Design a protein around this ligand. Sequence first.
Ligand SMILES: O=c1ccn([C@H]2C[C@H](O)[C@@H](COP(=O)(O)NP(=O)(O)OP(=O)(O)O)O2)c(=O)[nH]1
Ligand SMILES: O=c1ccn([C@H]2C[C@H](O)[C@@H](COP(=O)(O)NP(=O)(O)OP(=O)(O)O)O2)c(=O)[nH]1
Ligand SMILES: O=c1ccn([C@H]2C[C@H](O)[C@@H](COP(=O)(O)NP(=O)(O)OP(=O)(O)O)O2)c(=O)[nH]1
Ligand SMILES: [Mg+2]
Ligand SMILES: [Mg+2]
Ligand SMILES: [Mg+2]
Lengths: 142, 127, 133
Amino acid sequence: PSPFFKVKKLSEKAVIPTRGSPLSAGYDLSSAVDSKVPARGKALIPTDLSIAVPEGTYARIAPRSGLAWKHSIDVGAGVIDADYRGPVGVILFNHSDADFEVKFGDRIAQLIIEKIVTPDVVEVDDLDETVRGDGGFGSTGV
Amino acid sequence: SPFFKVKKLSEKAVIPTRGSPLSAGYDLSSAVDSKVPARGKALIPTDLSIAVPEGTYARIAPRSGLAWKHSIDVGAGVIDADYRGPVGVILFNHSDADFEVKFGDRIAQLIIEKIVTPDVVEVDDLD
Amino acid sequence: PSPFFKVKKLSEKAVIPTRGSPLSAGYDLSSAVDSKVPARGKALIPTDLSIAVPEGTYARIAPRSGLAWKHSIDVGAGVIDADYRGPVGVILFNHSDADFEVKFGDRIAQLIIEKIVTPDVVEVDDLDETVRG
Ligand SMILES: O=c1ccn([C@H]2C[C@H](O)[C@@H](COP(=O)(O)NP(=O)(O)OP(=O)(O)O)O2)c(=O)[nH]1
Ligand SMILES: O=c1ccn([C@H]2C[C@H](O)[C@@H](COP(=O)(O)NP(=O)(O)OP(=O)(O)O)O2)c(=O)[nH]1
Ligand SMILES: O=c1ccn([C@H]2C[C@H](O)[C@@H](COP(=O)(O)NP(=O)(O)OP(=O)(O)O)O2)c(=O)[nH]1
Ligand SMILES: [Mg+2]
Ligand SMILES: [Mg+2]
Ligand SMILES: [Mg+2]
């Protein structure tokens, strides 16, 4: 079917998520509360939204660039399942030594509806061999 | 058809399971006890090797409970479709509280993300 | 429509992104500068690239595992819109007590062209119910 993104407001403070540029990846999420993210700490910021996205996708809470370089803010967790109908919370980590203030309505993250596959796991005794093989953790160099 | 092939590397390994019916992720279990030091990191073995299809990769993604309760985040996390080595999970501990992972704990979730991998075309103008 | 990944060098310090293995998810990104990511701090590292990827995708700047494990480096931000035509910057956090040196040409992140959907958002009074838990 056609993809969709449906949102239900859980309070008046909720804000409809907002696209950026026309080919933009995400929908900006706004805080439904006044809060803060403590220096070198974390916070759970409610959006007061419940959402629905299609089977074969999930909604990823992803970081905004401005907040990253200006405030050292990153998004923790962030995997919203397509069948999750509870309140959507944004987990922020503050990797700086100053508290980050959040006012209600402030755009604190961006939601991206990522395409995925979910096949049944097939357990095998052997896998195919490749060029990469067991190479990882810097095997291709600096 | 998409696939997710999993090879157990030891009897400590657990076949990943999805936590809910339409869930994005297959939960990954730790094959060891391990300390994740405050403001530090740990590399946790799953004792699994995997294969996913060309046109996808396996992303090691953070679980919400570990993040919210324990300030745990997943570093790195890009498992290439051609990687046949052991899948390892990098955890960062973004708190001043030392934390301990126990054998069998679900410490991350694997998501098989759809991607494209075209050959790069260099241009002087992008549109 | 066939996917593409168009790249424009903004300087001679830019490097065309390359796949680290034949079926790699990502294209490695090189620093166009000598810089550093301070201990417990951050840096924006220019690539001197502008890029374009298709509608229905975005370019994700993602962390390399070697740098993550050896140097506690992680990638912040990282969402490059398919219609973004400015310079592509890599935002790095350093989660260790040791400064991390960046030399020009060092591969400091990887770019993954992730498939997405971008439907028009709609507010509803009631969502469809699901059996969860
Ligand atoms: O950042 C987040 C992450 C998750 N969530 C919600 C939606 C998601 O479908 C649901 C479960 O998230 P995780 O699977 O990542 N957390 P965990 O595995 O610890 O809990 P559970 O056992 O319920 O799956 O929590 C948020 O609201 N914000
Ligand atoms: O979290 C991770 C990340 C990577 N890996 C493995 C699988 C992956 O295909 C391989 C290489 O990952 P990256 O390309 O993201 N890191 P890096 O570029 O430093 O390693 P390499 O030079 O080998 O490509 O390491 C893990 O086991 N866990
Ligand atoms: O890591 C990044 C992230 C973004 N960017 C560029 C490309 C992206 O399309 C553009 C905007 O990214 P964000 O939406 O994450 N930033 P923000 O929401 O703060 O600002 P804007 O008003 O431009 O959307 O900045 C980078 O170069 N590196
Ligand atoms: Mg934006
Ligand atoms: Mg879960
Ligand atoms: Mg690599």
